[PDB]
Amino acid sequence: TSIRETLENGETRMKMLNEFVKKTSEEIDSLNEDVEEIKLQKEKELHK
Amino acid sequence: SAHLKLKEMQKVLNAHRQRAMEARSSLSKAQNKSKVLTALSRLQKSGRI
Numbered sequence A: 001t002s003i004r005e006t007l008e009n010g011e012t013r014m015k016m017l018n019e020f021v022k023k024t025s026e027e028i029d030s031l032n033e034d035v036e037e038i039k040l041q042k043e044k045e046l047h048k
Numbered sequence B: 001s002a003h004l005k006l007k008e009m010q011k012v013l014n015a016h017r018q019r020a021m022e023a024r025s026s027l028s029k030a031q032n033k034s035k036v037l038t039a040l041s042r043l044q045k046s047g048r049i
Helices: A002-044 B002-046
Strands: none
Touching: A002 B002
8 A cells, every 4th residue: 555655646746747847848949939039030120 | 261261171170180099099009909919929928927
């Protein structure tokens, strides 16, 4: 019973860590897109 | 009568004026929402907030 509880807690922690890693990857992709947009804006609008 | 006609047509201008403002106001509101929507599409997508 103790080993089953530990395995269930470990599986829940692994699922939470996977969800957090997916959210972090989505946030990193969004930040990269925003940085690319900012670089394109600084390249185009500064040409004058 | 000349200046009478003048005031007449200038009254029309006033009407046009305000009605134009009306349209302009609406347009502004519209475009306002538009750019507001841009924030709703951008600020929430970047995830920084």
